[model samples]
Target: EKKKADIVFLLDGSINFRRDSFQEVLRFVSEIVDTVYEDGDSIQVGLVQYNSDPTDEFFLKDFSTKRQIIDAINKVVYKGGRHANTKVGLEHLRVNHFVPEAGSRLDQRVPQIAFVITGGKSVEDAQDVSLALTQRGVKVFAVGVRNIDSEEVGKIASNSATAFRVGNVQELSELSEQVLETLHDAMH
Candidate 1:
C-alpha cells in the first residue's frame, strides 16, 4: 500500500511578538504544506494555534488541495494575548485532531506527525504533554523561533534531531528548507 501521513501544526499566537514576526513564522508552515502536500489525501495539513487559549484553526480533513491549505494558513490572523498555552494545544492534537473523526488515518496506521512552531515560552509543564504526544505515537517536530532556547525545543520534539531553533524570524526561511527533507522521511 502507498504511504499516507497526518500532519498537524501546533502554532504559537502569543502577544510577545511583532505582527510581522507572526506572519514570517507562518510562511514556514505554508511552504512546508506547499512542498509536502499531495492531493491533501496522502499528506493532510491542519493547524491549532494558541494565545491565552487555543484555537483549532483547521482539521486534517478540512481541505483537499495545496492552495486550499495554504490559503487557510494565510488567513490566520495574529490573535495575540499574554499567555502562550502550548500545553493545551499539544493535548488537543493528541486527543482531538489525531483521531478518525478529525481525518487522521491513524487507525489505518498512517504516520502521525506534528510541528510545534513556537515564538514564546509556555508553561514549564508543557513538556508533560510533549512527552505524552510522543508516547502515543505522534512524531513531533519542534520549531523554536526568536530567542527560544535550543534545549527547550529539544525536549518538546520527538528527539534532538527533530528539534530546530531559529535565532530570529528571518532565519526561519533557512530552517524551512532544512526541515522539509527531514520531515519527508519521517512521514512514513
Candidate 2:
C-alpha cells in the first residue's frame, strides 16, 4: 500500500495554451486523479489554474471522492489571458493550498507534491518560488508542453530528474501514467 500524500495540479490556463491543448492537459489531470485518489486517505488532490494570476479551483481537502474531484475537473473554465504567471501559480499552491487545514499534513511531515503543467511563459522568477516549495518539503514535478523552455521547466522542478517535457498535448496522455507511477514511488 502507498503512504498518504497531498498532491496539487498546477495548470497554466493562459492564452498561450491552445484551446485543444488545454483539453489534453485536463485529460491528463483527470487520469492521474483516477489512478491515485483513495477516498482522501491515501491521496488528496488540489487544483490551481493560472493565467495572469492563480485561481484556486479546489483545495486538497475539498473532495473525498473520485467522482467529486473529476466533476470539479470537468467544470474548470479556462482562465485565458495574455500572460502566464507560472511563478504566481507556484506561490499560490505553496502559500494557500498545501496547508494543514487544506488536508496537508506537512506539519506532521507528510509528503506533498505539486505537478506544475505549463507552456513556460512567466513574468516572475519561477526558480525562486520552486526553491521555496522544496524548502517547505514540497516536491515539484514540472511538466512543460509545446513552446516550453527546457531551462525554465528545470528550474521549476525540484530537480532535473523530476522535470518532463512533451512535444505536443497528445504526449501528455502517456506522460501522466509515468508521472502517476513516479508519484507513487516518491511517497513510498
Candidate 3:
C-alpha cells in the first residue's frame, strides 16, 4: 500500500478528544499503519499531534517498522485542550515536518500524504494552508466526526473526493482499508 510514500497523521488533540477518544484516534492511525509493508522503501509514517499547537510524536525518519510506529503512537500523551489550530498544524507540517531533513522524498519520486483527523472545529482557516500543500504535490485527506465543521474540513481537503466524514472515532477504524486503497490509487 505504500508505493514508496511518506504519510503523516495530523491529529487533533483538542478538548473534544478525551483520553478514550484519543486512543480511538490512535487506533485508527494504527490501523492504517498496519496496512502498509514494513520495508523502509515501501512507506514511512510520522505524526503531528495538535491542540493549541503541534507536537511531533515521531518524524518520518524515526521508524521503519509498523511495530515501532504503533508503539510510539501508543506512547503519545493526549494534549487535551479547546483549541484546534488546523492551519498552524498544516503549516508546521509544511514549514518544518515534511522536509528533506525529515526523510520526505522528492516531490516527483513518491507520493506524500497528509491525513488530517479532527473531532472538533478548527480555530483558524485552513483553506490556504491546504491549497499550498496540495500545490506542492501533497495529497491531503481530511477526516472528521461529530460537531466538526464540515466547511472547514472541506476546505482542508485536497479535493471533494479526498474528504471523509464518519459518525464518530469508533467508526473511523472502518475507513482504514478504504483509505489504503485510495492511497494506492493516488500513488499510481
Candidate 4:
C-alpha cells in the first residue's frame, strides 16, 4: 500500500486540442487511468478539462473504483475556447483540489501529483502556477502536444524527466507507456 498518490489530470480542450480530436485525449487518459488507478484509499484521481477556463470532470473524492473514473472520463465534453489558459486552470486545481474537502490525503503525507497536458500556447504564467503547486508539495508532470513550447513544459513539470512531448494526437497512445513508467518511478 506504499504506492499512495492523489493524481490530478489537467487536460487541454482548447480549439487546437479540439482540432486534434478530443476523443483521442479521452482514450489516452482512460488507458493511463486503467493502469494506475484502483478501488482503494491508496490511489485517488481527479480530472479536469480546460480551454479559456476549466471544468471538473471528477474530483479525488468523486469515485473510488477505476470503472467510475473511466466512466466519468468518457462523459467529458469538449469545452472549446479561443486559448489555452492553463495557468488559470492550474491555479484552480491548486486551491480547489488536494484539500481535505476534496478527499486528498495531502496532510497525511500522501503524494499529490499533477499531470498537465497542453496542446497550444498556454497564455499565462505556467511556471508560476506550477511553482505554486510544487511549493505546496505537489509533483508535477507536464505534457506538450503539437505546437507546444517545450520550454513551457519544462517550466511546468517538476523536472526534465517528468516533462513529456508528443508530436500529434496520433502519438498520444504511444506516450501512454512512457507515462506509466514515470508513474511507477514516482510511486515507488
Candidate 5:
C-alpha cells in the first residue's frame, strides 16, 4: 500500500451552526471524502464535533471503501447546547484518536491534519493546545466559518498560511480544493 495521510474534520456545532448551515458543512465534508478517498488504501478520516462537549463523531478509518465513510457522515446527528471548544477538540485528537496503532502500514509523516470549522468562538486554549500537537509532529489546519476568529485558527496552525477562513459551507468546494492543492505543493 502507498503512504497515506490522516485527515480529521472538526465542526463547531454551537448555536450558530443552524440545521441548514450544518447540512452545508456536512455536504462539504462529503465532497472532501469523495475527493481524498480516490487513493483508497492511502487515505483515512476522522470526524469530530465540539460544542458544550467534545464528540469524536468518527475515528481514523479508511474512507476509500466509500460506503463506510459516507455512512459515517450520514450518521452525524447534531445535538445542541454546547459551545465550541476548539482546544479540547484538538487535545482529543492528540490523546484519544489519530494514532495508527502497531503494525498499521500508514505513513506517519502525513500527520493527523485537523480541519476545524466554526461559526463562532471557542472555549479551549488554542495556542497551548496546538503547541502540544506540534510537539507531537501533528500539523493542525483550522478553518473558521463565517464570523469566526481567524487569528485563533491561524495561530493554531504551523503558520497563517496553513489556515483558512470562509464565510459559508458553499465556499467549501473552493476552500477544500485549495487545501488539496496546498497539500500537493507541500509534497515537493
Candidate 6:
C-alpha cells in the first residue's frame, strides 16, 4: 500500500540568519526530505523562504524524487534582509500555493501539514491569519529558532502542536526529526 502526505516548509531567511545558519536550515530540511522520501514513500515536499516578503523557491509536488528536492533547498542562500512581514508569507500560501488535494484536484486524503520556522515577529495581524489557516484544516507546526516570540509562535500553531528553540543550527536536524516523528505519530 502507498501512503501519501503533503508537507510545506516556511523558512525564515531574514538578515538575522545570515549565511551559516541559513545553510544549516537547508541541511536540516534535507534530512527531513530524506526521512519522508526514503523507500519511495509518497511524501511531497514544498518550500517557501521569507524575509521582507515571501518567495517560492520550490513547490511540494514539483520534485518526484527526494534528492531533487534536497538540491532545490540547498541551492537557496539567505539574502541579508530584514523580515518586515510574515502575514505576506501566510497569505501567499493561502492564495498562490497550497493544493487542497480535494474539492478541486488530486483527491489526497492526508491533511496538509506546514512546518513554519521563524525567528521574527509579524508586521501584520498574524494571529488572525493563523486562525484562518487552522479553520481551513491545515496543521501548522511552529518552530522558533533563537529569538522568536514564544507567545506569538505558540499562537501560530494549534493547541495540539509542537514548538522549539534551538541553540544552534547543528541542533536543527535533530529538532526536525523530533517534529516529524511527532507529526507522523499524530496522524495515527
The lDDT per prediction is 0.82, 0.84, 0.85, 0.85, 0.70, 0.71
lDDT of 4 by residue, 1-188 (tens): 64788899999998887644888888888898888765454788899899888888889999987888889888888878888898988888988887889888899988889998888778887888888788888889888889877788888898888899988887988878888888888776
Over 4 Å off in model 2, which ranges?
38-41
Compose the digit string of candidate 3's lDDT tens values, residues 39-70.
54478888999988999889989997778888
Q: TM-scores for all candidates?
A: 0.93, 0.93, 0.93, 0.94, 0.85, 0.87
* Model 4 regions lying over 4 Å from their true place: 38-41
Clashing pairs counted in every model: 0, 0, 1, 0, 4, 1
What does candidate 1's lDDT look like per residue over 1-188, in tens digits? 34478889988888756788889878878988887765424777889888767888999999867788899999998888877877877888888898999999888868889889888777645788888878878889998877579777877788887889887777888876678777877864
Q: What is candidate 2's CA lDDT for residue 168?
A: 78
Residue pairs in candidate 2 whose N, alpha carbon or C atoms collide under 3 angstroms: none
Candidate 5: 10-residue stretch with minimal lDDT: 102-111
Error of 2 at 33 (Å): 1.1
Which residue pairs collide, candidate 1?
none
lDDT of 3 at 104: 88
Query: Using alpha carbons, what is the TM-score of model 6?
Result: 0.87
Clash pairs for candidate 5: 51-82, 51-83, 52-82, 52-83
Q: What is candidate 2's CA lDDT for residue 163?
A: 86
Error of 6 at 159 (Å): 2.8
lDDT of 1: 0.82
